[PDB]
Amino acid sequence: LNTLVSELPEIYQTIFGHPEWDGDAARDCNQRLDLITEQYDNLSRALGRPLNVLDLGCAQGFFSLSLASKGATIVGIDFQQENINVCRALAEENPDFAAEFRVGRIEEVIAALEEGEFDLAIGLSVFHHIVHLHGIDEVKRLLSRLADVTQAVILELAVKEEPFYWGVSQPDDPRELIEQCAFYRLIGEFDRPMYLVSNHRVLINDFNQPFQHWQNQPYAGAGLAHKRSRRYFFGEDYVCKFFYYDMPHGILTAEESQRNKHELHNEIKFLTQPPAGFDAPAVLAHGENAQSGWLVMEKLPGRLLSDMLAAGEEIDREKILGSLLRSLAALEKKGFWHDDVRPWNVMVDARQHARLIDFGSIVTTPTNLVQSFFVFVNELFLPQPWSNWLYAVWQEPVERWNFALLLALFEKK
Ligand SMILES: Nc1ncnc2c1ncn2[C@@H]1O[C@H](COP(=O)(O)OP(=O)(O)OP(=O)(O)O)[C@@H](O)[C@H]1O
Ligand SMILES: C[S@@+](CC[C@H](N)C(=O)[O-])C[C@H]1O[C@@H](n2cnc3c(N)ncnc32)[C@H](O)[C@@H]1O
Ligand SMILES: [Mg+2]
Ligand SMILES: [Mg+2]
């Protein structure tokens, strides 16, 4: 071992189980391990078993042995013979660690990966070299591939502003390397951001679950209103709203950024403590960091009224309207209003019962929202008896218009 460590061109990491070398090492390593193992455990638990882990550019093997040290079956790749020779030496000293090391290039290793081989892959301070060599677009395709064949990827990414010659080749924002992947979240920063990424699972600390589908817009036909700053992930029994407070390319203004904040805090305040006698979807998890915030809630069944109308579906307008008026009256009695009641925020189930979603639209201060509900009634459809209903409402003075009165009048023929 002694000789193998002199044979290293550089001592990059702490050498595992050998404090004699801790001054020679360029990187102290512990702060980043505690974040990596914290995520190892989360995903280990969610999968229900120990993990297969791929350590890309493993250096002197510190992170792979540290993980093998907890039942992980690891593979370590580095393109320097000297590095792996040290890795195996350390692995031989720890003989019951399931630990294997290969001399290889990340580009080829990733190219040859089959889906499921590894649950977790780790790429710390290595992709910048590859961006310099092969370019931004080639590295995005490597990382898409790597995310597709694993459940989770941890990356620590060098940034352009660093005073090295390869800095100029890097994108403006390190998020440019991973924004094409479905899910990403910043989990730390050192002296360099560290991201947890996945194309298969929502990875929040208390909510680690696969998703079947995700979208970068709220509904068919929403356009680009949120400038792609909100992501929506659909599981079996949940929906996760993930809002970025800040985006690459500077595209989100300060006001757009506040909008993402207010709307999310507000929804959480509401769903966390909803007014008695109001069936609101349950909060399964929520949190935020400096970059973003998230809310995970129970998935209501059915389809958006907007899509049912788009597909020309046969709907019961009486049942949709009554159920929707019953809950708007109910909210109103308890001092709440929804300021965005439109087809695309109404979910309709198989029995034609209608529920609101998008509860960040809730305000707690009436006629102006009733007025606007007439646009909704109009989008919904005037035949009778709904022409009479509406004229009955219009005989009252506008100041008197509210949802109790819309509902009362609607219950008379
Ligand atoms: N509880 C839920 N159950 C089922 N689907 C939901 C639920 N919450 C949200 N959705 C779906 O996710 C989409 C986005 O949700 P929502 O409309 O609440 O987000 P938003 O960010 O407020 O967007 P916008 O205000 O632009 O409509 C909805 O259009 C709907 O398809
Ligand atoms: C700066 S280090 C990072 C070490 C370790 N992941 C960490 O952060 O502690 C970069 C490592 O990646 C290896 N490396 C760089 N480019 C590589 C490539 N294309 N293929 C394989 N290994 C590479 C180097 O040999 C070196 O050990
Ligand atoms: Mg909506
Ligand atoms: Mg909304």
Author numbering: 5 to 195, 203 to 376, 383 to 398, 418 to 449
Please give me the paper's original passages concerning this structure:
The chain length of the O9a O-PS is tightly regulated by the WbdD enzyme. WbdD first phosphorylates the terminal non-reducing mannose of the O-PS and then methylates the phosphate, stopping polymerization. The 82 kDa WbdD protein from E. coli O9a comprises 708 residues and contains three domains, an N-terminal methyltransferase (MTase) domain, a kinase domain and a C-terminal domain (residues 460–708) that includes predicted coiled-coil motifs. WbdD is an unusual enzyme since it combines both a phosphate-methyltransferase and a sugar kinase activity.
Removing this C-terminal helix (WbdD459) gave a monomeric protein in crystals (space group P212121) and in solution, confirming that the helical bundle drives trimer formation. The structures of WbdD459 and monomers of WbdD556 are very similar [r.m.s.d. = 1.5 Å (2538 superimposing atoms)], but there is a rigid-body rotation around the hinge connecting the N- and C-lobe within the kinase domain, accounting for the relatively large r.m.s.d. WbdD459, which lacks the C‐terminal bundle‐helix αV, showed a marked decrease in kinase activity but has lost the preference for 2α‐MB over d‐mannose. Thus, the C‐terminal bundle structure is clearly important both for biochemical activity and for polymer (substrate) recognition or co‐ordination. Of our structures, the ‘G-rich’ loop is most clearly defined in the Wbd459 structure, where it fulfils the same role as in Src; co-ordination of the AMPPNP (ATP mimic). However, in WbdD the loop protrudes further into the ATP binding cleft than the corresponding element in Src and it interacts with the catalytic loop through a π-stacking between W355 and Y230. WbdD binds ATP (or AMPPNP) via two Mg2+ ions (denoted Mg1, Mg2) that are co-ordinated by N356, D369 [part of the DFG motif which is almost universally conserved in kinases], E274 and all three phosphate groups of ATP (or AMPPNP), as well as by two water molecules. Mg1 bridges the α- and γ-phosphates, Mg2 the β- and γ-phosphates. We therefore attempted to co-crystallize WbdD556 and WbdD459 with d-mannose (KM > 100 mM) by soaking our crystals in saturated d-mannose solutions (∼ 1.6 M). Only WbdD459 crystals (with AMPPNP) withstood the treatment and gave additional electron density (not present before addition of d-mannose) that we interpret as two mannose units, Fig. 6A. The pocket is occupied by sulphate in the WbdD556 structure, these crystals were grown from ammonium sulphate solutions whereas the pocket is empty (with the loops disordered) in WbdD459 crystals which were grown from a non-sulphate-containing solution.
